[PDB]
Design a protein around this nucleic acid. Structure first.
Ligand SMILES: [Mg+2]
Ligand SMILES: [Mg+2]
Ligand SMILES: [Mg+2]
Ligand SMILES: [Mg+2]
Ligand SMILES: [Mg+2]
Ligand SMILES: [Mg+2]
Ligand SMILES: [Mg+2]
Ligand SMILES: [Mg+2]
Ligand SMILES: [Mg+2]
Ligand SMILES: [Mg+2]
Ligand SMILES: [Mg+2]
Ligand SMILES: [Mg+2]
Ligand SMILES: [Mg+2]
Ligand SMILES: [Mg+2]
Ligand SMILES: [Mg+2]
Ligand SMILES: [Mg+2]
Ligand SMILES: [Mg+2]
Ligand SMILES: [Mg+2]
Ligand SMILES: [Mg+2]
Ligand SMILES: [Mg+2]
Ligand SMILES: [Mg+2]
Ligand SMILES: [Mg+2]
Ligand SMILES: [Mg+2]
Ligand SMILES: [Mg+2]
Ligand SMILES: [Mg+2]
Ligand SMILES: [Mg+2]
Ligand SMILES: [Mg+2]
Ligand SMILES: [Mg+2]
Ligand SMILES: [Mg+2]
Ligand SMILES: [Mg+2]
Ligand SMILES: [Mg+2]
Ligand SMILES: [Mg+2]
Ligand SMILES: [Mg+2]
Ligand SMILES: [Mg+2]
Ligand SMILES: [Mg+2]
Ligand SMILES: [Mg+2]
Ligand SMILES: [Mg+2]
Ligand SMILES: [Mg+2]
Ligand SMILES: [Mg+2]
Ligand SMILES: [Mg+2]
Ligand SMILES: [Mg+2]
Ligand SMILES: [Mg+2]
Ligand SMILES: [Mg+2]
Ligand SMILES: [Mg+2]
Ligand SMILES: [Mg+2]
Ligand SMILES: [Mg+2]
Ligand SMILES: [Mg+2]
Ligand SMILES: [Mg+2]
Ligand SMILES: [Mg+2]
Ligand SMILES: [Mg+2]
Ligand SMILES: [Mg+2]
Ligand SMILES: [Mg+2]
Ligand SMILES: [Mg+2]
Ligand SMILES: [Mg+2]
Ligand SMILES: [Mg+2]
Ligand SMILES: [Mg+2]
Ligand SMILES: [Mg+2]
Ligand SMILES: [Mg+2]
Ligand SMILES: [Mg+2]
Ligand SMILES: [Mg+2]
Ligand SMILES: [Mg+2]
Ligand SMILES: [Mg+2]
Ligand SMILES: [Mg+2]
Ligand SMILES: [Mg+2]
Ligand SMILES: [Mg+2]
Ligand SMILES: [Mg+2]
Ligand SMILES: [Mg+2]
Ligand SMILES: [Mg+2]
Ligand SMILES: [Mg+2]
Ligand SMILES: [Mg+2]
Ligand SMILES: [Mg+2]
Ligand SMILES: [Mg+2]
Ligand SMILES: [Mg+2]
Ligand SMILES: [Mg+2]
Ligand SMILES: [Mg+2]
Ligand SMILES: [Mg+2]
Ligand SMILES: [Mg+2]
Ligand SMILES: [Mg+2]
Ligand SMILES: [Mg+2]
Ligand SMILES: [Mg+2]
Ligand SMILES: [Mg+2]
Ligand SMILES: [Mg+2]
Ligand SMILES: [Mg+2]
Ligand SMILES: [Mg+2]
Ligand SMILES: [Mg+2]
Ligand SMILES: [Mg+2]
Ligand SMILES: [Mg+2]
Ligand SMILES: [Mg+2]
Ligand SMILES: [Mg+2]
Ligand SMILES: [Mg+2]
Ligand SMILES: [Mg+2]
Ligand SMILES: [Mg+2]
Ligand SMILES: [Mg+2]
Ligand SMILES: [Mg+2]
Ligand SMILES: [Mg+2]
Ligand SMILES: [Mg+2]
Ligand SMILES: [Mg+2]
Ligand SMILES: [Mg+2]
Ligand SMILES: [Mg+2]
Ligand SMILES: [Mg+2]
Ligand SMILES: [Mg+2]
Ligand SMILES: [Mg+2]
Ligand SMILES: [Mg+2]
Ligand SMILES: [Mg+2]
Ligand SMILES: [Mg+2]
Ligand SMILES: [Mg+2]
Ligand SMILES: [Mg+2]
Ligand SMILES: [Mg+2]
Ligand SMILES: [Mg+2]
Ligand SMILES: [Mg+2]
Ligand SMILES: [Mg+2]
Ligand SMILES: [Mg+2]
Ligand SMILES: [Mg+2]
Ligand SMILES: [Mg+2]
Ligand SMILES: [Mg+2]
Ligand SMILES: [Mg+2]
Ligand SMILES: [Mg+2]
Ligand SMILES: [Mg+2]
Ligand SMILES: [Mg+2]
Ligand SMILES: [Mg+2]
Ligand SMILES: [Mg+2]
Ligand SMILES: [Mg+2]
Ligand SMILES: [Mg+2]
Ligand SMILES: [Mg+2]
Ligand SMILES: [Mg+2]
Ligand SMILES: [Mg+2]
Ligand SMILES: [Mg+2]
Ligand SMILES: [Mg+2]
Ligand SMILES: [Mg+2]
Ligand SMILES: [Mg+2]
Ligand SMILES: [Mg+2]
Ligand SMILES: [Mg+2]
Ligand SMILES: [Mg+2]
Ligand SMILES: [Mg+2]
Ligand SMILES: [Mg+2]
Ligand SMILES: [Mg+2]
Ligand SMILES: [Mg+2]
Ligand SMILES: [Mg+2]
Ligand SMILES: [Mg+2]
Ligand SMILES: [Mg+2]
Ligand SMILES: [Mg+2]
Ligand SMILES: [Mg+2]
Ligand SMILES: [Mg+2]
Ligand SMILES: [Mg+2]
Ligand SMILES: [Mg+2]
Ligand SMILES: [Mg+2]
Ligand SMILES: [Mg+2]
Ligand SMILES: [Mg+2]
Ligand SMILES: [Mg+2]
Ligand SMILES: [Mg+2]
Ligand SMILES: [Mg+2]
Ligand SMILES: [Mg+2]
Ligand SMILES: [Mg+2]
Ligand SMILES: [Mg+2]
Ligand SMILES: [Mg+2]
Ligand SMILES: [Mg+2]
Ligand SMILES: [Mg+2]
Ligand SMILES: [Mg+2]
Ligand SMILES: [Mg+2]
Ligand SMILES: [Mg+2]
Ligand SMILES: [Mg+2]
Ligand SMILES: [Mg+2]
Ligand SMILES: [Mg+2]
Ligand SMILES: [Mg+2]
Ligand SMILES: [Mg+2]
Ligand SMILES: [Mg+2]
Ligand SMILES: [Mg+2]
Ligand SMILES: [Mg+2]
Ligand SMILES: [Mg+2]
Ligand SMILES: [Mg+2]
Ligand SMILES: [Mg+2]
Ligand SMILES: [Mg+2]
Ligand SMILES: [Mg+2]
Ligand SMILES: [Mg+2]
Ligand SMILES: [Mg+2]
Ligand SMILES: [Mg+2]
Ligand SMILES: [Mg+2]
Ligand SMILES: [Mg+2]
Ligand SMILES: [Mg+2]
Ligand SMILES: [Mg+2]
Ligand SMILES: [Mg+2]
Ligand SMILES: [Mg+2]
Ligand SMILES: [Mg+2]
Ligand SMILES: [Mg+2]
Ligand SMILES: [Mg+2]
Ligand SMILES: [Mg+2]
Ligand SMILES: [Mg+2]
Ligand SMILES: [Mg+2]
Ligand SMILES: [Mg+2]
Ligand SMILES: [Mg+2]
Ligand SMILES: [Mg+2]
Ligand SMILES: [Mg+2]
Lengths: 76, 187, 59, 134
RNA sequence: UCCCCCGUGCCCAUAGCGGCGUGGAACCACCCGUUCCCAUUCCGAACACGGAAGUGAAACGCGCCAGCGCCGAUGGUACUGGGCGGGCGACCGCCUGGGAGAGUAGGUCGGUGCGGGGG
RNA sequence: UCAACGGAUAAAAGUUACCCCGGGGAUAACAGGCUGAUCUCCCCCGAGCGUCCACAGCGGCGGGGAGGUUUGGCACCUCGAUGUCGGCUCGUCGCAUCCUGGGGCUGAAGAAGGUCCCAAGGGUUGGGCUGUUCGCCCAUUAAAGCGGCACGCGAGCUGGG
RNA sequence: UCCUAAAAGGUAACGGAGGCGCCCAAAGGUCCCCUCAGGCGGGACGGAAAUCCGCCGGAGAGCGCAAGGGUAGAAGGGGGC
RNA sequence: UAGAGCACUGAUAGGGCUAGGGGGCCCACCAGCCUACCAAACCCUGUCAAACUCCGAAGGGUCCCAGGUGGAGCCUGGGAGUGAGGGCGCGAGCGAUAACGUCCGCGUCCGAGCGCGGGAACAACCGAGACCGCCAGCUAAGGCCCCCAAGUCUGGGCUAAGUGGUAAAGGAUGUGGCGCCGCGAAGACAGCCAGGAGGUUGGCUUAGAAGCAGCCAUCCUUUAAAGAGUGCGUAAUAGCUCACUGGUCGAGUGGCGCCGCGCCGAAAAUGAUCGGGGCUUAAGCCCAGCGCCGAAGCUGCGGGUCUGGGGGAUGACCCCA
């Protein structure tokens, strides 16, 4: 009875939460599409991954119709 | 209709029900108060009263108030009221559902059939001054398969409807029977 | 604030691991053991969980 | 009907939404106890009701069977039941209104709505219509 | 300090839809033309350039309206960490802390930051 | 298509009732157990049938349950062995009673019968066919009951299957 | 790919459902431009549905293929290099 | 996610509205009008969904800050065993809302606590984590009539079945308690005496259909009263009867709904039984309250050991946790 299939879990989601120090360029969120958009010092790769471009702390922000953004508020 | 209210605050609604006091609220654009009538009492009243007829509430402040029943939430599982709402009226154009007397037995009812009274009341804008105990309906020119919408109404003075001009009030429908069974179970 | 006295009375046996650890943090070794300590927000937090196993006095 | 396929069982926790109030009709029948009511069970009550007052008023049916009923043909363990043997059912939790009658006298509603209760796997109750609305 | 308009950002529908009224003096639009810069899978529609005359019609700014959209309590219940009791069960009840969705009362035709022209 | 996709060789299919060793009740077949869908019985409702008349007698559609004889599900003791159908001998227990005893109802004139209730005390035949159980049949009877006891009974027997 | 999976991640059964073993020198990079589906009305052949004009129409289209997530403030359609 | 919701995908009962279809009158020029039919779209009413979500908890997850010295935590390294698990509570799939069934998730106990008290007996249910000794003490669950420690304890109810001592739809003037409705001293409920009627024989079908098979249904008259009729009955009547009024009588009475305990439904195989005997204002059930018995739990006293600390220049050894 054909059905025993499935794919292996991809383990994705936010990796670093709001108010968390981050090193140069470590990943912050792995997402299916654009559940989140870039931000201050926060670029995104082919798989829509979101990673830091600088050190400092991560902060989230909901911009309604705009989207949900995530960025690093640096310091040094 | 009249009814004696009582003031409430921090006590447990659950505990009140234990004694026999049904909790509820009273409010309008300016008022809002934690209250509770006696169940057995409210029942006698609300049964007769309903959300069509006004109620005079009587607080221990000597205060009388012309409150309409807004909504009553029930205990699913063996029906029974849990908690009430009282809209304190004043003198401005308020809307509210008001009764409906379908007088006269339509052509269908006569020739065997069923009066399906879609509504039993109508949402209509109105002044606290106006509270037509009902609204008669000449439903008698109704043949089997016919209907009566809002557009046809005996609307008393100052009583404009809030609903649609299309929304139907009632209708006559065919009567299910045993001869019907032969056909149903077959096909 | 007042220090809390807390005596253990019902055996923690069979009770979920978490609470096992609470009685540990509250320094509650064995049963029927007395234990007086400061009433801080975080101290109560533990004494809170283990309520069903301890009676709290006030001193 | 359409939907899709076979469906998991799921439990029948408290009769929360399991219930309602009398919509149409003069009287009705409420479930006191949770259960899966079969298609057959339903029709059983229906046809009963009509048969009682021949050429009668109007019977409403507030419940409706959409859960697929799986079952195995007297075997063991490969795959999920081809199911559908009793076919389909309706999730009736304590409180729910199942049938409305209208256009008849009490002694008719009482009797018919009672006879129907004899086809249902459940303890039930027949309601007038108090007044409690909305 | 204030008011009008212009460009820009912010909160992201209480800002929106529609209805009604309103301003061209400055601003903005439309309008005149297409030689030149440049442009249409065809059309100066659009983008682009030169430029008075006309206009506030369209667009837009402003304001009033709630009919639609949008926001929306209170009380109360569902459910529920943690603790306890009951029925063979399908299940149900109590204590302690938490507590909606829906619906109701009601709110809304926005608010504000910077810069520039205009009295 | 090293696709048996972490890929044993470069290079490979059957059969054993002629069979054998190591292991397993970690796992089937018997039986027991748990369960009771299937099975057997009882019951609720009463459309309808029975001239009239829902229960003399009967009961659609659907509902609740008892029992643990069948078919089955699971895999729990038992694979350093718990012998398996049928017959024979000897039985013994249940009662949902086949007969005899007692009783209500009857669409019971009488005789005879229908059906329900009480009631194990004792009784419950001989032969043909088949390994048979089961069943059909012959001739009788008050009747030729059903079922439990490892589908009782192989340190009792048989050994047709 | 989705559900089961109990709002972190994970999570089983001969549990419920469906795909993959490719394709594209443009279906790729960039610069500029552009915005659907669908509904009503008007239109010679057409005709429910070609193409044309109007209005309404925030994403129900589209994104080579399954499904989901995303998405017109482009990832969608056109062009130049 | 539970919940809830219907705005997307689908599902859905009833009605409104309205394309296409069905069927009749009316047609051939094709058109129209009906429709107690089928039905898209749209609307209101009402609802369902693991793989639907406009919405959405308790909670969980992670970072920061603080408490937290614990047979905690981290790092390197030597040594392993284990890779059949099992039951219970909860949340799902499978299963049949079967299984001492199965498969995951969280927890837990057995495993290894078949050691100790409770549950008659019984790994995992309730109580509790056994270092040894004691003819000491408090308590846990459970229990206090005898076997068997300790109350035939106190107070207020209920149950008459041995219910308790462990079965379901469904049933019934079992009994107790609360509530609403109506009747009655201008005389109720019951019983009991009289009428209980007239067109009527209601109309329609049917062989027949006279309140009284089946179908449709709502008159008035004599009156204080008697249904176009309750049930029997005859082939069809009459009949008797309730309904219905008036008298006798003399005080209460009928019903609806909620709650507590009990009754029927209730049939098995070696001999019975709730562990037993026994128990009925209880030795049962519900509420309240004081006391006591009861473990290897805790306290008291003594000893052992190991760790930690303090005394010991001193080791030895001493005290304390
Ligand atoms: Mg799988
Ligand atoms: Mg996956
Ligand atoms: Mg997996
Ligand atoms: Mg998955
Ligand atoms: Mg009037
Ligand atoms: Mg935790
Ligand atoms: Mg000790
Ligand atoms: Mg079923
Ligand atoms: Mg098998
Ligand atoms: Mg009516
Ligand atoms: Mg009525
Ligand atoms: Mg029934
Ligand atoms: Mg029932
Ligand atoms: Mg009932
Ligand atoms: Mg309501
Ligand atoms: Mg100044
Ligand atoms: Mg200044
Ligand atoms: Mg800003
Ligand atoms: Mg205008
Ligand atoms: Mg002008
Ligand atoms: Mg010109
Ligand atoms: Mg030119
Ligand atoms: Mg020129
Ligand atoms: Mg030039
Ligand atoms: Mg020039
Ligand atoms: Mg250019
Ligand atoms: Mg060109
Ligand atoms: Mg020029
Ligand atoms: Mg001018
Ligand atoms: Mg002007
Ligand atoms: Mg204008
Ligand atoms: Mg404007
Ligand atoms: Mg809203
Ligand atoms: Mg709201
Ligand atoms: Mg609230
Ligand atoms: Mg809780
Ligand atoms: Mg809880
Ligand atoms: Mg508690
Ligand atoms: Mg139990
Ligand atoms: Mg809310
Ligand atoms: Mg609403
Ligand atoms: Mg409003
Ligand atoms: Mg607005
Ligand atoms: Mg506007
Ligand atoms: Mg300025
Ligand atoms: Mg200025
Ligand atoms: Mg200035
Ligand atoms: Mg391999
Ligand atoms: Mg190979
Ligand atoms: Mg792998
Ligand atoms: Mg090979
Ligand atoms: Mg070989
Ligand atoms: Mg072989
Ligand atoms: Mg062999
Ligand atoms: Mg051979
Ligand atoms: Mg041979
Ligand atoms: Mg041979
Ligand atoms: Mg040979
Ligand atoms: Mg050999
Ligand atoms: Mg061997
Ligand atoms: Mg085994
Ligand atoms: Mg077996
Ligand atoms: Mg059974
Ligand atoms: Mg069969
Ligand atoms: Mg059967
Ligand atoms: Mg029975
Ligand atoms: Mg029988
Ligand atoms: Mg019936
Ligand atoms: Mg009957
Ligand atoms: Mg007949
Ligand atoms: Mg009948
Ligand atoms: Mg039938
Ligand atoms: Mg049958
Ligand atoms: Mg049956
Ligand atoms: Mg059944
Ligand atoms: Mg049955
Ligand atoms: Mg059954
Ligand atoms: Mg059965
Ligand atoms: Mg078996
Ligand atoms: Mg197993
Ligand atoms: Mg041996
Ligand atoms: Mg032996
Ligand atoms: Mg008997
Ligand atoms: Mg019999
Ligand atoms: Mg006899
Ligand atoms: Mg005789
Ligand atoms: Mg007899
Ligand atoms: Mg042979
Ligand atoms: Mg014989
Ligand atoms: Mg025998
Ligand atoms: Mg057997
Ligand atoms: Mg057997
Ligand atoms: Mg045998
Ligand atoms: Mg032998
Ligand atoms: Mg033998
Ligand atoms: Mg033998
Ligand atoms: Mg031989
Ligand atoms: Mg032979
Ligand atoms: Mg042989
Ligand atoms: Mg996934
Ligand atoms: Mg999803
Ligand atoms: Mg998850
Ligand atoms: Mg998921
Ligand atoms: Mg959870
Ligand atoms: Mg989780
Ligand atoms: Mg779930
Ligand atoms: Mg998740
Ligand atoms: Mg499944
Ligand atoms: Mg290849
Ligand atoms: Mg190209
Ligand atoms: Mg278009
Ligand atoms: Mg149009
Ligand atoms: Mg045309
Ligand atoms: Mg066309
Ligand atoms: Mg056209
Ligand atoms: Mg979108
Ligand atoms: Mg596609
Ligand atoms: Mg796709
Ligand atoms: Mg997902
Ligand atoms: Mg997609
Ligand atoms: Mg998508
Ligand atoms: Mg989307
Ligand atoms: Mg899409
Ligand atoms: Mg592009
Ligand atoms: Mg591209
Ligand atoms: Mg290009
Ligand atoms: Mg929807
Ligand atoms: Mg709806
Ligand atoms: Mg619908
Ligand atoms: Mg429909
Ligand atoms: Mg519909
Ligand atoms: Mg219809
Ligand atoms: Mg038509
Ligand atoms: Mg039509
Ligand atoms: Mg037609
Ligand atoms: Mg014709
Ligand atoms: Mg016609
Ligand atoms: Mg003709
Ligand atoms: Mg038509
Ligand atoms: Mg509309
Ligand atoms: Mg709508
Ligand atoms: Mg609606
Ligand atoms: Mg609406
Ligand atoms: Mg969901
Ligand atoms: Mg969402
Ligand atoms: Mg909403
Ligand atoms: Mg909301
Ligand atoms: Mg936390
Ligand atoms: Mg810390
Ligand atoms: Mg190591
Ligand atoms: Mg394993
Ligand atoms: Mg396991
Ligand atoms: Mg484990
Ligand atoms: Mg486990
Ligand atoms: Mg189980
Ligand atoms: Mg352990
Ligand atoms: Mg033992
Ligand atoms: Mg036991
Ligand atoms: Mg053990
Ligand atoms: Mg044990
Ligand atoms: Mg003592
Ligand atoms: Mg005590
Ligand atoms: Mg005690
Ligand atoms: Mg007493
Ligand atoms: Mg007493
Ligand atoms: Mg007993
Ligand atoms: Mg019962
Ligand atoms: Mg009853
Ligand atoms: Mg009675
Ligand atoms: Mg009188
Ligand atoms: Mg007469
Ligand atoms: Mg006559
Ligand atoms: Mg005649
Ligand atoms: Mg007569
Ligand atoms: Mg007759
Ligand atoms: Mg008249
Ligand atoms: Mg005679
Ligand atoms: Mg005759
Ligand atoms: Mg007569
Ligand atoms: Mg009374
Ligand atoms: Mg019997
Ligand atoms: Mg008590
Ligand atoms: Mg007590
Ligand atoms: Mg004391
Ligand atoms: Mg000790
Ligand atoms: Mg000592
Ligand atoms: Mg030292
Ligand atoms: Mg030293
Ligand atoms: Mg020293
Ligand atoms: Mg020395
Ligand atoms: Mg010394
Ligand atoms: Mg010393």
């Amino acid at each position: 009875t054909k059905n025993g299939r499935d794919s292996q879990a991809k383990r994705l989601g936010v990796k670093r939460y709001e108010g968390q120090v981050v090193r140069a360029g470590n990943i912050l969120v792995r997402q299916r599409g654009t559940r989140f958009k870039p931000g201050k010092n926060v670029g995104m790769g082919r798989d829509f991954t979101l990673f830091a471009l600088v050190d400092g702390v991560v902060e989230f922000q909901d911009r309604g119709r705009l989207g949900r953004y995530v960025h690093v508020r640096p310091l040094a | 209709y009249r009814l004696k209210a009582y003031y409430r605050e921090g006590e447990k609604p659950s505990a009140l029900r234990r004694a026999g006091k049904l909790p509820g609220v009273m409010y309008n654009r300016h008022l809002n108060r934690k209250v509770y009538v006696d169940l057995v009492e409210f029942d006698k009243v609300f049964r007769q009263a309903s959300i069509h007829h006004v109620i005079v509430l009587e607080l221990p402040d000597g205060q009388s108030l012309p409150t309409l029943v807004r909504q009553v939430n029930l205990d699913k599982r063996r029906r029974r009221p849990e908690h009430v709402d009282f809209f304190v009226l004043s003198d401005e154009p308020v809307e509210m559902y008001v009764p409906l007397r379908f007088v006269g037995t339509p052509a269908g009812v006569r020739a065997g059939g069923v009066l399906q009274e879609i509504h039993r009341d109508i949402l209509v804008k109105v002044s606290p001054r106006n509270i037509p105990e009902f609204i008669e309906v000449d439903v008698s020119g109704l043949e089997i398969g016919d209907s009566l919408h809002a557009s046809d109404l005996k609307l008393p003075p100052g009583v404009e409807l809030a609903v649609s001009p299309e929304e139907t009030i009632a209708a006559v429908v065919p009567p299910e029977d045993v001869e019907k069974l032969a056909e149903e179970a077959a096909a | 604030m007042p220090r809390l006295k807390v005596k253990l009375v019902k055996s923690p046996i069979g009770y979920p691991k978490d609470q096992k650890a609470a009685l540990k943090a509250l320094g509650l070794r064995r049963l029927q053991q007395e234990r007086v300590l400061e009433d801080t927000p975080a101290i109560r937090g533990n004494v809170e969980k283990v309520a069903h196993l301890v009676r709290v006095e006030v001193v | 009907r359409m939907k899709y396929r076979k469906q998991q069982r799921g439990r029948l926790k408290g009769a929360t939404k399991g219930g309602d109030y009398v919509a149409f009709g003069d009287f009705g029948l409420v479930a006191l106890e949770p259960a899966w009511i079969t298609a057959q069970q339903i029709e059983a009550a229906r046809v009963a009701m009509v048969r009682h007052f021949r050429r009668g008023g109007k019977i409403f049916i507030r419940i409706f069977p959409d859960k697929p009923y799986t079952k195995k043909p007297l075997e063991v363990r490969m795959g999920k039941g081809k199911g559908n043997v009793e076919g389909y059912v309706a999730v009736v939790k304590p409180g729910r209104v199942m049938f409305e009658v209208a256009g008849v006298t009490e002694e008719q509603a009482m009797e018919a709505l009672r006879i129907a209760g004899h086809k249902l796997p459940i303890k039930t109750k027949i309601v007038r219509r108090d007044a409690y609305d909305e």
